[PDB]
């Protein structure tokens, strides 16, 4: 197989990593384990680290300006890398062996624990004119030849490279999500009924999504217009909740529904990237360096956390919107689902220009 | 700039049942962007080989892959009697995606296209691809030109999920590709018509949301100029 390589600057370390993903195994995330080259003749200060962090870039302006770097940490970790210490023993893994037996003992293996609740690598969509970096949520692998960490480290001193955490759909697909109401109104003897429900509750970016609806209107009002939104409830946790959302997909129907009448029909929506461009502020997933990416994944909850992550949740929901004749009488239903990645085999040859 | 892929084994042949090689010589380094196909004569060329190493779907295990640097190697290590027929080398790491001329050896889903015909220089014409059982906003859509007697090239492609268009240098602003995501058809006009623009067009189905190598395309639609 093959083998990914990073070089610092002064070419005193090269850091060999095997994959630029890890698969979330949801009860685990596959471990941070690569290796590092060093020159001893080169290196001086005999004491080199390397640390694995989920850092946050504080999202977008700071001083009301775009510019700095106002990484908020989620999580930091560094590992003694040369000399490895006495203490800290862990068994080799197979990939890092095998990087050894081509490198030999002049590189040093190191292990990374990530625990879960933790947030999945996303971005929120950069407006227009924003040339800064991406601002969001991803992982981030950095060497550097250090006395200790309270050292300034030297950008020439180091070298750095980016990773992002992936989620897959679990082969169960999930039971239909479906939503019914039936709105009263003060001017209607019966009340408005409304049923709405989707094909399945899995499903996989850029193929669409079918919902069925069915209204039973006996009242003395009608249906007159239809709406349809796949929303994207995306919170976030920098000091607090907040339940920042944007449509993703929106679909008209003039589908008239008078008193005393019934209605079912079918729809489908597909969400992409094209017609939500110019929409700043949007989540998509993991981010390496400019390159055009995905829509958000369906970020998964573990059902035994404790909802208390002070990351990124992203969720899908569909709203049915019914206007009524003119009170807030029209009535949105709303139907929660999952929108994410099919099963993970291989990297990302995300296509770019040469 | 522009990628080459060029294939040593240009000509085998009086070969049964055996283990065969096929080497694929990469202009530039291109990791695993590399697949190989097969093609009969005059059929829908369809995929065998993806990233060098991923067998396809139904494809007999008696086909495999190597990659040794910018070298790609292929073996059968038994000819069954219907494997004759031409397999292409493509890199697929940088637009434009660059097929090599294949290598002919011998012994002594839904996907359609249309609109084909001849056309004086200078003309226009539109080419349709009907897709079905799949979508566009899933799977990129690809033109694919086949000159006879020469090499594959990439020319057209539409990133529905993304609406990006990208052709060739051949055809900047001069052929022009659209998607009808309603009737999940792919058009394509051509302009200011030349003798080079006489050949077989395929159109070829990506699966856009994770990109993988060319699966199940069309029958090919000729388009012919002449004075």
């Known amino acids: 197989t093959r083998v990914f390589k990073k070089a610092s600057p002064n070419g005193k370390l090269t850091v060999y990593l095997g994959k630029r993903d890890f698969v979330d195994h949801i009860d685990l995330v596959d471990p941070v384990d690569g290796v590092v080259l060093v020159d001893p003749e080169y290196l001086k200060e005999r004491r080199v680290y390397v640390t694995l962090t989920c850092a946050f870039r504080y999202g977008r302006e700071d001083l009301d300006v775009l510019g700095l770097t106002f990484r908020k940490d989620l999580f930091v970790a560094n590992v003694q890398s040369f000399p490895p210490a006495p203490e800290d023993k862990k068994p080799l893994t197979r990939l890092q062996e095998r990087l050894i037996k081509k490198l030999g003992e002049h590189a040093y293996p190191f292990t990374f624990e990530i625990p879960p609740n933790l947030p999945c690598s996303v971005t929120l969509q950069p407006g227009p004119e924003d040339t800064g970096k991406a601002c969001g949520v991803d992982y981030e692998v950095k060497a550097f030849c250090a006395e200790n960490l309270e050292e300034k480290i030297h950008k020439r001193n180091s070298v750095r490279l980016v990773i992002r955490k992936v989620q897959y759909a679990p082969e169960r697909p999930g039971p239909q999500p479906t939503a019914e109401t039936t709105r009263q109104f003060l001017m209607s003897d019966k009340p408005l009924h409304l049923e709405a429900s989707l094909d399945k509750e899995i499903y996989y970016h850029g193929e669409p999504i079918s919902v069925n609806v069915h209204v039973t209107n006996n009242t003395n009002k009608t249906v007159k217009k239809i709406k349809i939104s796949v929303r994207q409830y995306a919170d976030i946790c920098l000091f607090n909740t907040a339940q920042y959302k944007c449509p993703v997909a929106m679909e008209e129907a003039d589908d008239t529904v008078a008193p005393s009448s019934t209605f079912c029909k079918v729809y489908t929506l597909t969400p992409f990237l094209a017609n939500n461009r110019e929409k700043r502020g949007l989540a998509l997933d993991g981010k390496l360096k400019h390159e055009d990416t995905n829509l958000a994944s369906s970020t998964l909850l573990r059902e035994g956390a404790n909802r208390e992550i002070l990351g990124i949740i992203v969720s899908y929901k569909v709203k049915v919107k019914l206007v009524v004749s003119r009170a807030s009488s029209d009535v949105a239903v709303e139907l929660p689902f999952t929108l994410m990645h099919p099963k993970p085999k291989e990297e990302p040859p995300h296509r770019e220009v040469p | 700039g522009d990628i080459q892929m060029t294939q040593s084994p240009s000509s085998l042949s009086a070969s049964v049942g055996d283990r065969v090689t096929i080497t694929c010589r990469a202009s530039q380094s291109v990791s695993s962007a590399v697949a190989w196909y097969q093609q009969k004569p005059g059929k829908a060329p369809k995929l065998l080989i993806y990233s060098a190493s991923s067998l396809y779907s139904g494809v007999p295990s008696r086909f495999s892959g190597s990659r040794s640097g910018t070298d790609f190697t292929l073996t059968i290590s038994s000819l069954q009697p219907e494997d004759f027929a031409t397999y292409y080398c493509?890199?697929?790491?940088?637009?434009?995606?660059?097929f090599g001329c294949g290598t002919k050896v011998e012994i002594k889903v839904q996907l359609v296209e249309s609109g084909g015909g001849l056309v004086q220089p200078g003309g226009s014409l539109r080419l349709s691809c009907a897709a079905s059982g799949f979508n566009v906003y899933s799977s990129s859509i690809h033109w694919v030109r086949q000159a006879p007697g020469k090499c594959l090239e990439w020319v057209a492609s539409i990133s529905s999920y993304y609406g990006y268009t990208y052709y060739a240098d051949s055809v900047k602003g001069r052929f022009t590709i659209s998607a009808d995501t309603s009737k999940n058809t792919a058009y394509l006009q051509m302009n200011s018509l030349r003798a080079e623009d006489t050949a077989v067009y395929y159109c070829?189905?990506?699966?856009?949301?994770?990109?993988?190598?060319?699966?199940?395309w069309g029958q090919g639609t000729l388009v012919t100029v002449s004075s």
């Open positions: 070829a189905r990506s699966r856009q949301f994770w990109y993988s190598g060319l699966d199940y």
């Open positions: 493509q890199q697929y790491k940088y637009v434009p995606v660059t």
